[PDB]
């Protein structure tokens, strides 16, 4: 009844042991990069998945790949583990929302059972019609499926789009003309799938059937209603069953997977979730928590990595890691219920939970200086031809419920148009007329969690530009002048100073007969990426490799004398990356580390006062202290004369914003409008706004 | 706490429902082809595997394939399912017994922890030696692994055999010369792996370590001892950790998988096993049952398809299907504990359990007629250069414990030599000198469970030769003579009578854009495999397609007038295939059905009295009634003047044999000898023979 883990030394874990209770709601918390995500996914999920995959067939196990064995002594009390995260892929066009949620099969069964046959030539009711003289075969569930030759459209082989343009025959219905003739309640299968989830649930609720039809089709109706209710309680009440799976975002895919797992009813499975509440409005938090509790009540163990206060208060057991990040983290500081953590004096989460540390609402807010950005005729996706004014020089937050269209309206329209107008891009913008006020801006930079590189030749030091200064100060030493060296000698990108064996990468590729490529450190350079002649030069007792190896915190004291390097190192420390090292490969950096590197690079630049920054959910996977630091950094950037636009669902970040734009009042076809605009105080006075109500409650 | 299954209609299941208790020892029983194996594997295992695979990554799920959805209404209370069966594959040479059992990792850890360094050039002890002037790196567990560049032999990339001949450098050790220098207790890792499992366990038990060594290496020793004990209790105490996984047989692989599953300690997993006791001697039955109970006691549900009496008596819940096979089966006849089934008057298993029906020991036994088969210098595998005499004209059974070498000695030596001498084969026989008495035999036929064909053009009717008689009697009708037809017209292999659309196969291949090939019935012939002109001819109110469609039981009454067809149909009914149809495709036949078809074909032949039949475990997946029928058929074949040699572990079949040859007294290197020979009464008088003791107890 316990999951005993001993000798966990994965990544930065400091040889810790823990006993996680089974069949309970367990939440893991900690600072960003403190090792909680590693401790969960790389140890427990990896072991649970491997112990089940290895027992399967040899062909399937090899096809799925060989998961790396975690550095753990022994794990006791383990079950097969399923991980849900925002890591979806396009996969294939054959899969849609209905197929993933396993409701299309029930729809096919219902249409085969109580469907009403019809003639596609004469339009009358029917197994043959005396008017059109056409004979039809027996009704089977296989006919309504587009994955079989009996029902798939012959022109587009049941894909709905010739390889992409829509199929002219079925117009994307993915089914034969004869199959679509069968209609239930005046709507065929395609029309039912085209409806929204809530609309479909309402239609099924009030559907009228005869006594025989109700008697024969009851379990199917019950299952369909239960699955639709699960989907609604999850939060995706605006989606359509006919939507392709690839087009869904990470959060939508994760929530769909959660709903499918709830519907399946699997028992004795360890579920590991990575921030289920991300990309979700505050009003859906209670429903999400209820859904999580319902999933747990099926006989499953829940391991949720969430920093939400409501999730903390609704959990059974909380495990806190820290007290810092990187080399300062990897230890269990607090453990117990929420009350024990709140009373714990050495817990980072408890300090914010008890109210000792909190984000203070500013007493003064900036005002626009007559410069505005106007968007005219925004009609992309569900936008109802609205016009929005975005003030310049202030901190602007775009709020609204999920599916309101804020992410599309920002990313696919404003950022694309600004990039085309300023950076001379080659990407088609969204459906809009024109943008007024572009001349007030000079450049636009988008900050996200995408990796900063794909090769080991890119490092945070090189990205921030401090590597050039380091090379110059190394070449300015007495030894370099004596030996006639150049500033480019101390670089792993130009031949002459780097090691020729690994070409400056520091690693070598070894190919096995029946195994994938394995990367090992270079033997000639011992992973130092430099030859002996270059490494012979030392400045202040340290060489170039030693300088690259040390962390930002050590570099702060080491480079106190040089002001130009000191400024960049101080910026990197202020963006919260004091534990990282300058020589770390960009391929190993996480999303948060890459975002912090980009923020530090933007801060170090000489702002001209005509720069616009766009951030899409910057608080993904961030603790309360990380949120406070990010708010401070954003406020500093705004005070630097630039403009910041952030799409955020966190109330703490929202309450500190200067301008708020609300999109709603619902999601999907029910949204795309503008509800409230202005300062947070003004928005809090709007009655018909959920964000306004939550802001009024917070303030 | 229950597994509720409703509306199960897979294959021949007659829409049954059942409630299987959870976390209990459950045994499913029934006649061969009664639908128990289908009801278990195709429904429960398929659903449990699919509900876990679909939740995994898209790339892994598609790589592992898409399991077919069973025809079941709904299943409640399900967990991920693991199926263990004799369906292993060669896979890759990179996997051995130790790697599969997950003991090689612990061996590497132990050698890295308490290993004794040594010099491979001077032979002295050592991190460098002042004599050879050679420096060695730090000892790490990765060095002892052959799947990494640090330890793999460079000549053969860590495979142990260049692509096959052994690597001249490492001589199959799969490791570098420096790695093998580290020895624990006078033996390196390769020598430890080369030892038998029991010998290795004994060596580890009496291994002497210092106080510090014992303190630092205790968990590893405990895990190694536990895994070795599990392997011994399973029954494979003669295997070697260095043996390749591909060379293992089906039973050995299944038992290794069982031992690995026990060692892993997974919880909340439904385990489905297909005859775990097959290929195992009676003396290991108690140990196997104890191992199964220990595996269940970890919090798992056991679904065992076994016909053993001891398994029935050691189980918690028994579900019995029947009462017949094929169309007569697919229903739950009895359900409850062993006492309830024994008292049940309409249970097939209970009738044999209570003693109402039993196999009677013959009161007289046949004697050899001076004709014997002599094998001289049999040295293949573990045979210790023994000579065996096999009498001719009688029923001979080859017994012995697992690993004694009976299967090798028979199949790879005697059958191969007889085939080369008589049928003019091109397969190299085993290590033997010569065989005396070959001139007494005319031909040798081996009967196994391999499929009788790979195309739909082969059917049991064509295999037995009755199809030619059916074609002749169809062409002898008045209509065929009037239309000038030929005997070859009513055949799906020659153009002229068969349907040209499907070329007589009856199915068509349809290729999808992103899906594998799908086979559907031919539209032109409607699956009848004949054109309208041929089908127009009817004999006694039935056409050729109708004749092919009907079962053997109906054909018995239909073809009473024709004696030649009646004899073959009666033979097919007597071999227990009265439920099968003549037109069934050979690709869909199971192993038991194929074996019965081969037995019927052999029975229908005109025996010349100089034929030898070899059967390897013919009682695989057979009920008690099936065993009785097989014993009767074998006795009839022996009485037909031929010779039968059967390698069987079942005591019921053994007690009815005329001659018994015992190989032992142990398995592996401890066996390969001859213990007892003669009649079962004589064998039962041998004290140092487990088979003799069991025969004495039975008689
Ligand atoms: N490729 C697409 N095809 C059809 N409809 C789409 C597509 N992409 C988005 N939509 C819909 O158009 C709207 C886009 O809203 P979007 O801006 O993506 O969501 P949001 O309000 O920011 N919520 P969230 O992503 O959950 O944080 C939603 O109603 C989507 O369902
Ligand atoms: N390819 C191989 N390489 C090495 N040893 C082998 C190989 N095949 C078999 N052996 C060994 O040689 C002997 C062969 O015995 P075998 O006849 O296969 O077993 P058996 O006594 O019939 N038992 P079972 O198969 O369990 O019913 C055993 O000791 C095996 O471990
Ligand atoms: Zn009509
Ligand atoms: Zn189409
Ligand atoms: Zn190098
Ligand atoms: Zn030496
Ligand atoms: Zn080698
Ligand atoms: Zn045809």
Reduce the secondary structure of B522-555 to three states and give it as a string. CCCCCCCCECHHHHCCCECCECHHHHHHCEHHHH
| The residue to which tokens 């500190």 are assigned | A656
Residue A162 CA, ligand 4 centroid: distance in Å: 8
Question: Does B317 lie at the interface with A, CB-CB under 8 angstroms?
Answer: no
Pick from B397, B463, B399: nearest CA to B596: B463
Question: Does A64 lie at the interface with B, CB-CB under 8 angstroms?
Answer: yes
In the numeric block, which tokens belong to residue B296? 């269940």
Pick from A49, A51, A52: nearest CA to A84: A49
| The residue to which tokens 């999400």 are assigned | A288
Cβ A266–B219 below 8 Å, yes or no?
no
Tell me the C-alpha distance between B505 and A372, whole Å: 75
Cβ A64–B63 below 8 Å, yes or no?
yes
In the numeric block, which tokens belong to residue A309? 């206060």
What kind of experiment solved this structure? cryo-EM
Q: Reported resolution in A?
A: 3.0
| The residue to which tokens 């979700």 are assigned | A280
Tell me the C-alpha distance between B349 and B322, whole Å: 10
Q: What is the rounded radius of gyration, in angstroms, for the C-alpha atoms of chain B?
A: 29
How many angstroms separate the most distant Cα atoms in chain A? 104
Our CA angle for A97, A99, A105, nearest 5°, is: 135
Binding site per annotation, positions of B for ATP: 30-37, 400-407
Torsion sign (Cα): A592, A596, A602, A603: positive
Cβ A91–B62 below 8 Å, yes or no?
yes
Q: Using omega within 30 degrees of 0 as the cis cutoff, is the peptide bond preceding B323 cis?
A: yes
Tell me the C-alpha distance between A102 and A292, whole Å: 19
A407 CB under 6 A from ligand 1?
A: yes
Question: Does B516 lie at the interface with A, CB-CB under 8 angstroms?
Answer: no
Tell me the C-alpha distance between B288 and B311, whole Å: 10
| The residue to which tokens 């025996």 are assigned | B607
Contact B201, B233 (CB under 8 A): no
Pick from B665, B683, B686, B685: nearest CA to B674: B665
Cβ-Cβ contacts under 8 Å, B65 against chain A: 60
Give the other-Cβ count within 10 Å of A381's Cβ. Answer: 17
For ligand 1, mutation pick of A238, A280, A403 (most atoms within 8 Å of CB): A403
Q: What is the rounded radius of gyration, in angstroms, for the C-alpha atoms of chain A?
A: 29
A402 CB under 6 A from ligand 1?
A: yes
Cβ B260–A55 below 8 Å, yes or no?
yes
Q: Give residue ranges with CB within 6 A of ligand 2.
A: B 238, 247, 249, 251, 279, 381-382, 400, 402-408, 667-668
**Residues near A321 by beta carbon (within 8 Å), at least 6 away in sequence:** A28, A29, A30, A31, A34, A35, A36, A39, A329, A330, A331, A332, A333
Cβ B514–A93 below 8 Å, yes or no?
yes
Q: What is the location of CATH 3.40.50.300 in chain A?
A: 2-88+248-354, 372-451+590-698
Residue closest by Cα to atom 10 of ligand 2: B381
Query: What does each C-alpha distance from B214 to A156, B220, B343, B548 come to in angstroms?
Result: 69, 10, 57, 73
In the numeric block, which tokens belong to residue A171? 């117009």
Architecture of the domain made up of B372-451+589-698: 3-Layer(aba) Sandwich (3.40)
DSSP for residue A584? -
Question: Does B269 lie at the interface with A, CB-CB under 8 angstroms?
Answer: yes
Q: What is the location of CATH 1.20.1580.10 in chain A?
A: 117-182, 460-588
Residue A363 forms beta bridges with which residues? none
Phi, psi of B192 (to 5 degrees): -65, -45
Residue closest by Cα to atom 6 of ligand 2: B381
Our CA angle for A278, A88, B60, nearest 5°, is: 135
List the alpha helices (DSSP H) in A504-577: 532-535, 544-549, 552-558, 563-574
CATH H-level superfamily of A372-451+590-698: P-loop containing nucleotide triphosphate hydrolases (3.40.50.300)
Helix B285-296 with B250-264: angle, nearest 10 deg: 40
Contact A39, A228 (CB under 8 A): no
Contact A447, A599 (CB under 8 A): yes
Contact A275, A306 (CB under 8 A): yes
CATH H-level superfamily of A117-182: ABC transporter ATPase  like domain (1.20.1580.10)
For ligand 1, mutation pick of A196, A408, A667 (most atoms within 8 Å of CB): A408
Pick from A592, A241, A600, A629: nearest CA to A450: A592
Tell me the C-alpha distance between A649 and A562, whole Å: 41
Tell me the C-alpha distance between B386 and B663, whole Å: 10
**How is domain A2-88+248-354 classified at the CATH fold level?**
Rossmann fold (3.40.50)
| The residue to which tokens 């594959």 are assigned | B89
Q: Cα distance from B1 to chain A (closest Cα, Å)?
A: 10
For residue B151, which ligand has an atom nearest its CA? 7
**Residues near A640 by beta carbon (within 8 Å), at least 6 away in sequence:** A607, A609
Query: What does each C-alpha distance from B44 to A567, B31, B37 come to in angstroms?
Result: 65, 20, 10
Architecture of the domain made up of B460-588: Up-down Bundle (1.20)
Residue closest by Cα to atom 24 of ligand 1: A402
First to last CA, chain B: 44
Cβ A80–B515 below 8 Å, yes or no?
no
Residue of B nearest to A271 (CA): B55
Residue of A nearest to B146 (CA): A512
Residue closest by Cα to atom 26 of ligand 1: A402
For residue A121, which ligand has an atom nearest its CA? 3
Helix B563-574 with B591-604: angle, nearest 10 deg: 140
Centroid of chain to Cα B521: 33
Does A228 appear as a known binding residue? no
Contact B3, B77 (CB under 8 A): yes
H or E segment at A680?
A: helix A680-683
Pick from B150, B148, B138, B147: nearest CA to B113: B138
Interface-testing mutation among B23, B64, B223, with chain A (most A C-beta atoms within 10 A): B64
What are the E-state strand segments in B53-155? 74-76, 81-84, 128-129, 134-135
Find residues 159-198 of chain B whose CB sits inside 8 Å of chain A: 159, 163
Find residues 222-251 of chain B whose CB sits inside 8 Å of chain A: 223
In the numeric block, which tokens belong to residue B533? 């002109």
How many residues are present in chain B? 699
Q: What is the dihedral of CA A73, A78, A79, A83, to 10 degrees?
A: -60
**Residues near B383 by beta carbon (within 8 Å), at least 6 away in sequence:** B405, B408, B409, B672
Q: Which of A64, A94, A223 sits opposite B64 (nearest CB)?
A: A64
H or E segment at B643?
A: strand B643-647
């Amino acid at each position: 009844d316990y999951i005993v883990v001993k000798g966990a030394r994965e990544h930065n874990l400091k040889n810790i042991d823990v006993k996680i209770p089974r069949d309970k709601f367990v939440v893991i918390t900690g600072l960003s990069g403190s090792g909680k995500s590693s401790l969960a996914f790389d140890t427990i999920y990896a072991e649970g998945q491997r112990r089940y995959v290895e027992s399967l067939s040899s062909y399937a196990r090899q096809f799925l790949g060989q998961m790396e064995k975690p550095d753990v002594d022994y794990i006791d009390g383990l079950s097969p583990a399923i991980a849900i995260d925002q890591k979806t892929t396009s996969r294939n066009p054959r899969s849609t929302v209905g197929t993933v949620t396993e409701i299309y099969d029930y729809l096919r069964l219902l249409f085969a059972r109580i469907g009403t046959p019809h003639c596609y030539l004469c339009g009358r009711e029917i197994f043959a019609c005396t008017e059109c003289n056409v004979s039809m075969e027996e009704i089977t569930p296989r006919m309504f499926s587009f994955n079989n030759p009996y029902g798939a459209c012959p022109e587009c082989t049941g894909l709905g789009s010739l390889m992409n343009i829509p199929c002219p025959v079925c117009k994307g219905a993915r089914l034969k003309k004869e199959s679509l003739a069968v209609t239930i309640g005046g709507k065929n299968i395609y029309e039912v799938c085209c409806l929204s989830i809530g609309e479909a649930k309402e239609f099924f609720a009030n559907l009228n059937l005869t006594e025989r039809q109700q008697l024969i089709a009851r379990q199917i109706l019950k299952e369909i209603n239960a699955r639709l209710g699960f989907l609604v309680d999850v939060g995706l009440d605006y989606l359509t069953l006919a939507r392709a799976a690839g087009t869904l975002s990470g959060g939508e895919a994760q929530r769909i997977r959660l709903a499918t797992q709830i519907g399946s009813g699997l028992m004795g499975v360890i579920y590991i979730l990575d921030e289920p509440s991300i990309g979700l409005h505050q009003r859906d938090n209670d429903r999400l928590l209820r859904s999580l509790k319902k999933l747990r009540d099926l006989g499953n163990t829940l391991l949720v990595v969430e920093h939400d206060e409501d999730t903390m208060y609704a959990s059974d057991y909380i495990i806190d890691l820290g007290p810092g990040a990187g080399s300062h983290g990897g230890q269990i500081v607090a453990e117990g219920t929420v009350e024990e953590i709140k009373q714990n004096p050495n817990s980072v989460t408890g300090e914010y939970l008890s109210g000792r540390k909190k984000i203070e609402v500013p007493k003064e807010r900036r005002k626009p200086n007559g410069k505005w950005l106007e968007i005219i005729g925004a009609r992309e996706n569900n936008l109802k031809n609205i016009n929005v004014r975005i003030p310049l020089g202030v901190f602007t937050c775009i709020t609204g419920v999920s599916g309101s269209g804020k992410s599309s309206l920002i990313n696919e329209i404003l950022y694309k148009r600004l990039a085309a107008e300023l950076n001379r891009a080659s990407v088609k913008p969204g459906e809009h007329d024109l943008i007024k006020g572009i001349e007030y801006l000079d450049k636009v930079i988008d900050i996200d969690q995408s990796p900063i590189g794909r090769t080991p030749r890119s490092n945070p030091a090189t990205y921030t530009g401090v590597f050039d200064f380091i090379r110059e100060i190394f070449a300015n030493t007495t030894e370099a002048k004596t030996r006639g060296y150049k500033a480019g000698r101390f670089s792993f990108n130009v031949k002459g100073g780097r090691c020729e064996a690994c070409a400056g990468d520091g690693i070598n590729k070894i190919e096995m007969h029946f195994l994938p490529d394995i990367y090992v450190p270079c033997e000639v350079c011992k992973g130092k990426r430099y030859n002996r002649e270059t490494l012979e030069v030392r400045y202040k007792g340290k060489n170039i490799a030693e300088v690259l190896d040390m962390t930002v915190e050590e570099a702060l004291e080491f480079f106190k004398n040089i002001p130009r390097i000191h400024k960049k190192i101080e910026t990197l420390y202020d963006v919260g990356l004091g534990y990282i090292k300058l020589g770390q490969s960009s391929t190993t950096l996480s999303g948060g580390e890459a975002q912090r590197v980009k923020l530090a690079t933007e801060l170090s630049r000489k702002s001209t006062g005509k720069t616009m920054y766009i951030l899409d959910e910057p608080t993904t996977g961030l603790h309360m202290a990380d949120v406070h630091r990010l708010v401070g950094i954003l406020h500093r950037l705004v005070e630097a004369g630039n403009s910041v636009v952030v799409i955020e669902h966190n109330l703490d970040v929202i309450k500190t914003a200067d301008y708020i734009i609300d999109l709603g009042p619902e999601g999907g076809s029910g949204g795309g409008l503008v509800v409230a605009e202005g300062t947070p105080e003004e928005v809090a006075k709007v009655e018909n706004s959920y964000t306004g109500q939550f802001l009024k409650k917070v303030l």
